Amino acid sequence: APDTSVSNKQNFSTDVIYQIFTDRFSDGNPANNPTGAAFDGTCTNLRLYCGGDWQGIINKINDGYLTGMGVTAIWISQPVENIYSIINYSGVNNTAYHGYWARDFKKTNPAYGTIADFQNLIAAAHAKNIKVIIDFAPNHTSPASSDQPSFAENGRLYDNGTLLGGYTNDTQNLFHHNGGTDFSTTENGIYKNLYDLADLNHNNSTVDVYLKDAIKMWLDLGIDGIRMNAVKHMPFGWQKSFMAAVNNYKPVFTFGQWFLGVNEVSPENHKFANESGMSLLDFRFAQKVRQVFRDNTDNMYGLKAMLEGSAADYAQVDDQVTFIDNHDMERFHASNANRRKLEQALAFTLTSRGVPAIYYGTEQYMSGGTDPDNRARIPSFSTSTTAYQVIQKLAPLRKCNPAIAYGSTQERWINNDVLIYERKFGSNVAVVAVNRNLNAPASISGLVTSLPQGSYNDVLGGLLNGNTLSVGSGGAASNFTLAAGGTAVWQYTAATATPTIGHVGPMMAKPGVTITIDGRGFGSSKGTVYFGTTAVSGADITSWEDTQIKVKIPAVAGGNYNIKVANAAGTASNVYDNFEVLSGDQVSVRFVVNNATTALGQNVYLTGSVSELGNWDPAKAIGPMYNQVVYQYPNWYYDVSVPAGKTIEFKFLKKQGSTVTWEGGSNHTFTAPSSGTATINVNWQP
């Protein structure tokens, strides 16, 4: 199938995700509704179950609501069994309607449906060219009272019905007992409880092996993607090991939730997206959008800065899942705000780089404050809304115009309130004009584009007061007036002659695993694939078509390789960098070094004889390591993904900037577990 096929689990850049709060979408089966104090059929008490389930999703998939909108993928609440308790938080009853309080990762949440129901949902979706993404929160189980065991379900973790352990009397140390996080530091938010939620200990072999086995069941069930909950609250090294487990089995597009506040630009976050094996929800993008289009706290120069910066900071900016709101923030549409603000933010998002995600009901102009007022039941299934039509008109462009799915992004015209940007990929172009100023039109002169000479009709058909464009020679557009609150889209599509790679997934795996290379101009006859200088052709190239190529990763040494391809004629494509070839199956190992004294600003890192540890290159060292929670300075610790069963030599370094101090003596050595976890403890050698 082609790159845009529903069968493409490794690429969502040509799709448009619709995030569904399962309980608040559609109750397709009243028979599975919880009862009594745990239920409110009228969905007035937004903290109880409202009855929304998987059958309801199936129904809306079958009645054209989602298809008619151009939605090609859905992101649903965590499907696993949650606790059944009703939690009283200061006179307020609560339930796990949101699916974030897991109790058994190998079972379904009855409220949502059964295993069969889930299977039916997968089949119904795939039958309508709709991919299924599931939320997965392996950070914790549920709320628990380390003091009072009778509280809730004591954060009890079950394994397909078999109790593994609870928060109280945690002799096995399935959980963390480091108190609660104040979000003061990254390490603080990782090894301490998220609120009162029982923090799972991924360095516990039973926990590590359990979770990995769990996701495998869901993969076997047919999921096309994973949305990892609170990734900034789990060990990065462990998550890499988790992603390797997924990629080395059945790779599916995975993105994590790493919240970013207004104006927050974090290198840690960039590094995670660039090296974890998963992408992220674009909070940087979402927060700037809200400033620019919703709150009026930044102008188009901020949007432009975000677009340029993000393209340079994220190795795979096209893998970042964009959005304008979600279940953890005020609904984008303010009760008395001008609807055009939402329509414009949506139009911008749908035509921008990455993977667009639309919070359910956005298209019905739902308003609401923070939890749980942002999770009201969808008020209508109308297709006549302006927002609904904007999506219906733009969403499909991600499939028919590779410029929008894989194209670069360039600012072509700009001022305080106006942004005109261009997307380009092969013989495809798209230009988007946006005037956020709802009371003042703008005069556009001097606009230059990559569009071929001619007249271009607004794809939105003037729905958002757009207009026709006139392109002359050199691609210079004739003067035009951009209406107040105007938004227009102009495009050009044609067959691409030369091989051009627009996407690669997954971006991290061990040799032998099959990767998907998408783009255009590959030709119909098998060509060549390059991993760095290594050439791959013939049998290992499972399939080759103009837009998609499936090839097995060659048995090259672990490392970072640049991906390139050549058509049958020998014509080379562009280079898609940052591909990580694993040294093999991975395991999460905790490295601990004692007595590593440093000065303020100086940190300790880990370097080793394998690519997973940077092959002795300080620039590629692992860290900086932690020294507050699990161990205290001068003791340092860190959880790293390493090649399972390999004898590895390592050493520690002290670094300030790029200046590096090597641990003295000889190399430390150890053999990585064949499965599960392990902890290596050593003293820093002078």
Ligand X SMILES: OC[C@H]1O[C@H](O[C@H]2[C@H](O)[C@@H](O)[C@@H](O)O[C@@H]2CO)[C@H](O)[C@@H](O)[C@@H]1O
Ligand Y SMILES: OC[C@H]1O[C@@H]2O[C@H]3[C@H](O)[C@@H](O)[C@@H](O[C@H]4[C@H](O)[C@@H](O)[C@@H](O[C@H]5[C@H](O)[C@@H](O)[C@@H](O[C@H]6[C@H](O)[C@@H](O)[C@@H](O[C@H]7[C@H](O)[C@@H](O)[C@@H](O[C@H]8[C@H](O)[C@@H](O)[C@@H](O[C@H]9[C@H](O)[C@@H](O)[C@@H](O[C@H]1[C@H](O)[C@H]2O)O[C@@H]9CO)O[C@@H]8CO)O[C@@H]7CO)O[C@@H]6CO)O[C@@H]5CO)O[C@@H]4CO)O[C@@H]3CO
Residues of the shown chain interacting with Ca ion in the complex, contacts defined by CB under 5 A: 27, 29, 32-33, 51, 53, 139, 199, 233, 315, 577
Residue 600 binds to ligand Y (criterion: CB under 6 A): yes
Choice between 348 and 413, CB closer to ligand X? 413
Got the DSSP string for 45-67? STTSB----HHHHHHHHHTTTTG
The partner in contact with residue 315, picked from ligand Y, ligand X, Ca ion, none with C-beta cut-offs of 5 to 8 angstroms by kind, is Ca ion
Choice between 143 and 155, CB closer to ligand Y? 143
308: alpha, beta or left? (left if phi > 0; alpha if psi -120 to 50): alpha
- Strands 442-444 and 428-435, bridge-based pairing: unpaired
CB 18: neighbour CB atoms within 10 A? 29
- Sign for the CA dihedral angle at 150, 152, 157, 161 comes to positive
Cβ neighbourhood burial of 57 (10 Å; 0-12, 13-18, 19+): buried
Residue 413 binds to ligand X (criterion: CB under 6 A): yes
Among 616, 673, 678, 683, binds ligand Y (CB under 6 A): 616
Number of residues that bind ligand Y (CB under 6 A): 38
CB 468: neighbour CB atoms within 10 A? 12
Kind and range of the H or E run holding 126 = helix 115-127
Among 25, 49, 65, 259, binds ligand Y (CB under 6 A): 259
Within positions 168 to 187, which residues make up the interface with ligand Y, using CB under 6 A? 183-185, 187
Choice between 17 and 444, CB closer to ligand X? 444
Kind and range of the H or E run holding 410 = strand 408-414
Residue 257 binds to ligand Y (criterion: CB under 6 A): yes
Residue 308 binds to ligand Y (criterion: CB under 6 A): no
Three-state DSSP at 288 gives: helix
Bridge partners (DSSP) of residue 543 are 550
CA dist., res. 58 & res. 122, Å (int): 9
Three-state DSSP at 118 gives: helix
The partner in contact with residue 651, picked from ligand Y, ligand X, Ca ion, none with C-beta cut-offs of 5 to 8 angstroms by kind, is ligand Y
Tell me how far, at minimum, the Cβ of 487 lies from ligand X, in Å.
Answer: 17
End-to-end alpha-carbon separation of the chain, Å?
58
CA dist., res. 95 & res. 82, Å (int): 9
CA dist., res. 595 & res. 428, Å (int): 58
Three-state DSSP at 219 gives: helix
99 and 77 Cβ atoms separated by less than 8 Å: yes
Choice between 164 and 476, CB closer to ligand X? 476
Tell me how far, at minimum, the Cβ of 376 lies from ligand Y, in Å.
Answer: 13
CA dist., res. 525 & res. 470, Å (int): 39
Q: Which stretch binds ligand Y (CB under 6 A): 194-202, 292-300, 305-313, 495-503?
A: 194-202
The partner in contact with residue 474, picked from Ca ion, ligand Y, ligand X, none with C-beta cut-offs of 5 to 8 angstroms by kind, is none
Tell me how far, at minimum, the Cβ of 624 lies from ligand Y, in Å.
Answer: 7
> Of all residues in the chain, what percent are helix, strand and coil, respectively (each to 5)?
25, 30, 45
Tell me how far, at minimum, the Cβ of 3 lies from Ca ion, in Å.
Answer: 17
CA dist., res. 541 & res. 538, Å (int): 6
Residue 230 binds to ligand Y (criterion: CB under 6 A): yes
Choice between 32 and 548, CB closer to Ca ion? 32
686 and 662 Cβ atoms separated by less than 8 Å: no
Residue 599 binds to ligand Y (criterion: CB under 6 A): yes
Name every residue whose Cβ is closer than 8 Å to that of residue 619 and which is 6 or more positions away in sequence: 658
The partner in contact with residue 465, picked from Ca ion, ligand Y, ligand X, none with C-beta cut-offs of 5 to 8 angstroms by kind, is none
Residue 446 binds to ligand X (criterion: CB under 6 A): yes
Give the total residue count for the chain: 686
Choice between 459 and 482, CB closer to ligand X? 482
Cβ neighbourhood burial of 295 (10 Å; 0-12, 13-18, 19+): middle
Choice between 91 and 446, CB closer to ligand X? 446
| Token pair recorded at residue 606 | 């880990």
Residue 448 binds to ligand X (criterion: CB under 6 A): yes
The partner in contact with residue 328, picked from ligand X, Ca ion, ligand Y, none with C-beta cut-offs of 5 to 8 angstroms by kind, is ligand Y
Within positions 87 to 106, which residues make up the interface with ligand X, using CB under 6 A? none
Kind and range of the H or E run holding 341 = helix 339-350
Q: Which residue is nearest to ligand X (CB)?
A: 446
Among 311, 414, 536, 678, binds ligand X (CB under 6 A): 414
The partner in contact with residue 648, picked from Ca ion, ligand X, ligand Y, none with C-beta cut-offs of 5 to 8 angstroms by kind, is none
| Token pair recorded at residue 401 | 């115009």
Residue 364 binds to ligand Y (criterion: CB under 6 A): no
Residue 526 binds to ligand Y (criterion: CB under 6 A): no
Residue 603 binds to ligand Y (criterion: CB under 6 A): yes
431 and 448 Cβ atoms separated by less than 8 Å: no
Q: Which residue is nearest to ligand Y (CB)?
A: 230
Choice between 2 and 634, CB closer to ligand Y? 634
Number of residues that bind ligand X (CB under 6 A): 7
The partner in contact with residue 526, picked from ligand X, Ca ion, ligand Y, none with C-beta cut-offs of 5 to 8 angstroms by kind, is none
The partner in contact with residue 600, picked from ligand Y, Ca ion, ligand X, none with C-beta cut-offs of 5 to 8 angstroms by kind, is ligand Y
Binding site for ligand Y (CB under 6 A): 89, 94, 98, 100, 137, 143, 183-185, 187, 194-196, 229-230, 232-233, 257, 259, 327-328, 371-372, 598-603, 609, 616, 627-628, 633, 651, 662, 664, 667
Binding site for ligand X (CB under 6 A): 411-415, 446, 448
